[PDB]
């Protein structure tokens, strides 16, 4: 490590870990600089070999190790952290082959691992690592976003046992959905435990936690709706202080998830939502509490209304999991680019057709609103397939005009000297008719297009991402208390108050898993033409012998 | 000659779901803040889900909500009181005006649109045809 | 019969063909030594 370590990767790795760092690069970093200046040494000449870029040399050492799926895993998370930090174009393809020969291997002996013994592989994925990197198998698969390996069967299977709990697998879901309703029914056999004690079995699967949260989610959406709409006056009734006292747990949910994580956390999009529906929702209330003057009480229902907007588009993302629509929602995010491309155009044809028409038709409004209204909104209404109107003098009628701004009207058209509209209709007329047509008809059928097409291209992979975000989600809900929403608070106030064989196994896999490598390359079968070699030498030596034999006859 | 296009109706079904839980979500959703940010205490069931449902439903046909705009609303088909059976009028302020804003609800209003009558519909399509080229291979077997 | 047939044409039987006449070239070989052998 310290004379042979090549200065060049020896500088980046050091640039790699002062300015990105991570759960793994830090002690790896620790590792080389101890050794420069379990104790693991296999594992610190693989890394050495292939943070050098050496394929061969760090397949022959990956051999040797210990614990080969999650070496494999970090080998390729690392290769793909330090290509995220290369510039040149030339070793960012190499560094991306590597890795992804490096995952191709782990996810074929797991494959190998699981088709043998399922309870000794599923050991194998939980198995802690002994300082490896910090984590497990699924651990830096999830931050490499391995894919492959998160989506194969075994892993799935894995999942589906954990997220199921107690309750066996091979359980019908409307038979466990219907035994959630009604509580009797769960101690009849219609729900099983293959896997009183029953009862605690089946509330504590995060399957029926998240029904439940789901349920009452629902009834917090109705109860909001009720407030807002028939039970809102200047002193909130005893329904409005319910729902106060539900937002409030939502709310110390909100600051448990801002200590367990930093700024991180705000990374994601519905977190954001998540606290601008919560902040949205105080603002509401402050601006409530205001019974004296009705302007505030106005102010704060119209808060909560879009609040409630805010809280009434997060079931899109709560339902991601039923199997049925999840893929759906996940390929919904897909498809930006075309609405964008969409209402690029849309807002060039929007606004010349409105300016010139305002131009030609009316001069001198000097009322911003109404600009507004004429230039933006009416063209934007032709998209549904209302005609503008008021380009023929015809059906124009002076009733609904004004020819001063007093009123809350349209201005009058610009009339000539005998009192007649001075704009012409053969310019207007086909003016409209051409902007119809493009916007109606053409933009929205190219959209239709694209997003066929996009549907087409996608679904190749999209079960794949949905699986990767299902054990996101399985793993979120696994990892929180495991309590239904309602009866959270008690448990954050009680815990406030108060606070080797599968190796061995592995080695032999991955020693037959070799071997089938090695039978497959051998597949070949071309060992006819060394027989072929084999069988002419024999015959050349036979009659060399027989020249001998004649020789030594005369 | 139509017993193929009949067998293969019956496998589109997951995405009309799909369609009709996206738009009953922002139907509700627009629905109800339509409604509290126009009018307060309405009382009366069958005129509630009339303005929260039905109206944002006809929208799905081209036809807008209307009543978001003041210039266009008039005081003759609402009613101050309950006993007739016309909408409730508008909150009104101090000086005998309408009372909420528009430059919140046509917006809002123009976003509803364009998520339900245009976005939705392409997508519906699109998967019909993705599902359409699918199925194709084995509707005659069936 | 039809499968065995399918199977069969694989056509690989020229390798087989090889190693026999092989073979006989390695007894027809055997003979010739015996036969210099005896003349000596
Ligand atoms: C209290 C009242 C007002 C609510 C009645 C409305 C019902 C239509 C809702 C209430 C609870 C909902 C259920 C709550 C939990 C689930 C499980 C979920 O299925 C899964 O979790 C699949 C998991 C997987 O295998 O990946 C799909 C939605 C479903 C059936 C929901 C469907 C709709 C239900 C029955
Ligand atoms: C300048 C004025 C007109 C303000 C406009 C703001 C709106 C355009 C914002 C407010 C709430 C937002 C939405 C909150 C919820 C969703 C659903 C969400 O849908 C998905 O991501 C599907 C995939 C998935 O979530 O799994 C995308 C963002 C969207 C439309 C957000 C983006 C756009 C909205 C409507
Ligand atoms: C009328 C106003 C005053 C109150 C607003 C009512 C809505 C908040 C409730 C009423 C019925 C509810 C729906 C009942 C059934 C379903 C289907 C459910 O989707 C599934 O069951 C998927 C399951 C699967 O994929 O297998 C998602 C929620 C939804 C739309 C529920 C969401 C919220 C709704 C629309
Ligand atoms: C394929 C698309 C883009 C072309 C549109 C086809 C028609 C809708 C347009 C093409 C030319 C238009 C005409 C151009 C000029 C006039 C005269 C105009 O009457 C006048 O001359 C106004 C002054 C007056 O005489 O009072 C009435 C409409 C008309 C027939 C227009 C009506 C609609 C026409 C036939
Ligand atoms: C007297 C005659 C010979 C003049 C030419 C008649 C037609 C060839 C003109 C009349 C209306 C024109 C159309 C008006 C609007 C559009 C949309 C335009 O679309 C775009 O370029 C991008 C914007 C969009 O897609 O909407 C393409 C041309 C087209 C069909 C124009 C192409 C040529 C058209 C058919
Ligand atoms: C007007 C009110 C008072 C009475 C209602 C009349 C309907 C019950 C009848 C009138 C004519 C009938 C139609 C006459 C012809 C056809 C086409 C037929 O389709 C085929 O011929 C397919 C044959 C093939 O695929 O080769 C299916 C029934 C239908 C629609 C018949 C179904 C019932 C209809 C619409
Ligand atoms: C809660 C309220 C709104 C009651 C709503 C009930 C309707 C939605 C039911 C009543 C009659 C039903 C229909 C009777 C006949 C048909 C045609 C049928 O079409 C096919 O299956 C084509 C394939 C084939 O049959 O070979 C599907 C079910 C449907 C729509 C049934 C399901 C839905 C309908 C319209
Ligand atoms: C791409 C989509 C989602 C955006 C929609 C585009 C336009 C239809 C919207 C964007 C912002 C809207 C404007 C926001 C604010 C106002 C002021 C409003 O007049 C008022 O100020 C009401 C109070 C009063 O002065 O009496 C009239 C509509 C207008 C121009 C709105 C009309 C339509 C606009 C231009
Ligand atoms: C002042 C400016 C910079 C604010 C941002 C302007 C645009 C980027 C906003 C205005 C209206 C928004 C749109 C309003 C509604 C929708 C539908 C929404 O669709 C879904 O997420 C699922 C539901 C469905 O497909 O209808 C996706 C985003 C989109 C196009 C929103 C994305 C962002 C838009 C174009
Ligand atoms: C606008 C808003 C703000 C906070 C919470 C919600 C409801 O969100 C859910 C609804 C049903 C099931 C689970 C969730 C959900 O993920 N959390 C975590 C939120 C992470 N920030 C809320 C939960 C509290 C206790 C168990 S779960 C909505
Ligand atoms: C300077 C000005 O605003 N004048 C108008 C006037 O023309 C109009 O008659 C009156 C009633 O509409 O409102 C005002
Ligand atoms: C308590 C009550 O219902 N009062 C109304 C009253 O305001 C209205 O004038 C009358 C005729 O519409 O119907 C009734």
Same mark, same amino acid.
């Given at each position: 490590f310290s004379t042979?370590?090549?200065?060049?990767?020896?500088?980046?790795?050091?640039?790699?870990?002062?300015?990105?760092?991570?759960?793994?690069? +830090?002690?790896?970093?620790?590792?080389?600089?101890?050794?420069?200046?379990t104790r693991h040494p296999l594992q610190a000449l693989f890394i050495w070999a292939i943070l050098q870029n050496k394929k061969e040399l760090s397949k022959v050492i990956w051999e040797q190790t210990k614990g080969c799926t999650l070496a494999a895993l970090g080998?390729?998370?690392?290769?793909?952290?330090?290509?995220?930090?290369?510039?040149?174009?030339?070793?960012?393809?190499?560094?991306?082959?590597?890795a992804n020969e490096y995952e191709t291997r782990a996810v074929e002996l797991f494959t190998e691992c699981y088709s043998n013994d399922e309870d000794l592989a599923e050991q194998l994925l939980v198995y802690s690592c002994e300082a490896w990197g910090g984590s497990?198998?699924?651990?830096?698969?999830?931050?490499?976003?391995?894919?492959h390996?998160?989506?194969?069967?075994?892993?799935?299977?894995?999942?589906?046992?954990?997220?199921?709990?107690?309750?066996?697998?091979?359980?019908?879901?409307?038979?466990?959905?219907?035994?959630?309703?009604?509580?009797?029914?769960?101690?009849?056999?219609?729900?099983?435990?293959?896997?009183?004690?029953?009862?605690?079995?089946?509330? +504590?699967?995060?399957?029926?936690?998240?029904?439940?949260?789901?349920?009452?989610?629902?009834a917090f959406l109705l109860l909001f709706a009720?407030?807002?709409?028939?039970?809102?006056?200047?002193?909130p009734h005893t329904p409005e202080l319910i729902?106060?006292?539900?937002?409030?747990?939502?709310?110390?949910?909100?600051?448990?998830?801002?200590?367990?994580?930093?700024?991180?956390?705000? +990374?994601?999009?519905?977190?954001?939502?998540?606290?601008?529906?919560?902040?949205?929702?105080?603002?509401?209330?402050?601006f409530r509490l205001h019974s004296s003057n009705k302007s505030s009480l106005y102010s704060g229902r119209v808060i909560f209304c879009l609040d409630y907007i805010i809280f009434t588009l997060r079931l899109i993302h709560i339902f991601t999991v039923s199997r049925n629509l999840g893929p759906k929602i996940i390929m919904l995010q897909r498809?930006?680019?075309?609405?964008?491309?969409?209402?690029?155009?849309?807002?060039?044809?929007?606004?010349?057709?409105?300016?010139?028409?305002?131009?030609?038709?009316?001069?001198?409004?000097?009322?911003?609103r109404w600009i507004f209204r004429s230039v933006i909104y009416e063209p934007y209404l032709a998209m549904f397939g209302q005609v503008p109107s008021d380009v023929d003098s015809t059906t124009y009628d002076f009733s609904h005009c004004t020819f001063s701004g007093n009123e809350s009207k349209p201005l009058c058209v610009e009339l000539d000297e005998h009192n007649?509209?001075?704009?012409?209709?053969?310019?207007?007329?086909?003016?409209?008719?051409?902007?119809?047509?493009? +916007?109606?008809?053409?933009?929205?059928?190219?959209?239709?297009?694209?997003?066929?097409?996009?549907?087409?291209?996608?679904?190749?992979?999209?079960?794949?991402v949905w699986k990767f975000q299902r054990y996101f989600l399985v793993q979120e809900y696994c990892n929180r208390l495991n309590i239904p929403f309602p009866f959270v608070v008690f448990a954050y106030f009680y815990m406030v108050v108060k606070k080797n064989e599968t190796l061995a196994w592995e080695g032999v896999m991955k020693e037959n898993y070799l071997v089938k490598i090695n039978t497959k390359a051998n597949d070949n079968s071309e060992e006819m033409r060394h027989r072929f070699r084999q069988l002419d030498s024999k015959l050349n030596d036979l009659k060399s012998l027989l020249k001998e034999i004649a020789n030594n006859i005369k």
């Amino acid at each position: 490590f310290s004379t042979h370590f090549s200065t060049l990767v020896y500088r980046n790795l050091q640039i790699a870990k002062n300015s990105y760092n991570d759960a793994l690069l +830090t002690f790896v970093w620790k590792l080389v600089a101890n050794f420069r200046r379990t104790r693991h040494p296999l594992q610190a000449l693989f890394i050495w070999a292939i943070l050098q870029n050496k394929k061969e040399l760090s397949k022959v050492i990956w051999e040797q190790t210990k614990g080969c799926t999650l070496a494999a895993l970090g080998a390729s998370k690392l290769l793909k952290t330090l290509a995220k930090v290369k510039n040149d174009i030339n070793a960012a393809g190499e560094s991306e082959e590597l890795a992804n020969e490096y995952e191709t291997r782990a996810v074929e002996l797991f494959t190998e691992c699981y088709s043998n013994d399922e309870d000794l592989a599923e050991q194998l994925l939980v198995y802690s690592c002994e300082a490896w990197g910090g984590s497990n198998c699924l651990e830096l698969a999830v931050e490499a976003t391995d894919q492959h390996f998160i989506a194969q069967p075994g892993v799935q299977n894995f999942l589906s046992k954990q997220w199921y709990g107690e309750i066996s697998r091979d359980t019908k879901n409307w038979k466990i959905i219907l035994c959630l309703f009604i509580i009797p029914l769960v101690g009849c056999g219609l729900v099983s435990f293959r896997k009183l004690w029953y009862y605690v079995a089946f509330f +504590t699967s995060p399957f029926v936690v998240f029904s439940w949260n789901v349920v009452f989610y629902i009834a917090f959406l109705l109860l909001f709706a009720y407030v807002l709409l028939m039970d809102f006056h200047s002193v909130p009734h005893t329904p409005e202080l319910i729902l106060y006292a539900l937002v409030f747990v939502l709310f110390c949910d909100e600051v448990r998830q801002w200590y367990m994580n930093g700024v991180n956390y705000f +990374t994601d999009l519905w977190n954001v939502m998540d606290t601008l529906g919560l902040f949205y929702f105080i603002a509401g209330i402050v601006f409530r509490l205001h019974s004296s003057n009705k302007s505030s009480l106005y102010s704060g229902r119209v808060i909560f209304c879009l609040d409630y907007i805010i809280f009434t588009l997060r079931l899109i993302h709560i339902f991601t999991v039923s199997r049925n629509l999840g893929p759906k929602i996940i390929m919904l995010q897909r498809m930006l680019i075309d609405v964008f491309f969409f209402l690029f155009l849309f807002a060039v044809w929007m606004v010349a057709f409105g300016v010139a028409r305002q131009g030609i038709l009316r001069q001198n409004e000097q009322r911003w609103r109404w600009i507004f209204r004429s230039v933006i909104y009416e063209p934007y209404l032709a998209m549904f397939g209302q005609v503008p109107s008021d380009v023929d003098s015809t059906t124009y009628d002076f009733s609904h005009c004004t020819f001063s701004g007093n009123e809350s009207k349209p201005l009058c058209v610009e009339l000539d000297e005998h009192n007649l509209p001075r704009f012409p209709e053969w310019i207007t007329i086909p003016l409209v008719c051409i902007y119809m047509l493009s +916007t109606n008809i053409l933009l929205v059928n190219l959209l239709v297009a694209m997003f066929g097409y996009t549907v087409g291209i996608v679904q190749e992979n999209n079960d794949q991402v949905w699986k990767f975000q299902r054990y996101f989600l399985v793993q979120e809900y696994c990892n929180r208390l495991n309590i239904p929403f309602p009866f959270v608070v008690f448990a954050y106030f009680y815990m406030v108050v108060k606070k080797n064989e599968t190796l061995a196994w592995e080695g032999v896999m991955k020693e037959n898993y070799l071997v089938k490598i090695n039978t497959k390359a051998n597949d070949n079968s071309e060992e006819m033409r060394h027989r072929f070699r084999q069988l002419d030498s024999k015959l050349n030596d036979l009659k060399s012998l027989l020249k001998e034999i004649a020789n030594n006859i005369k």
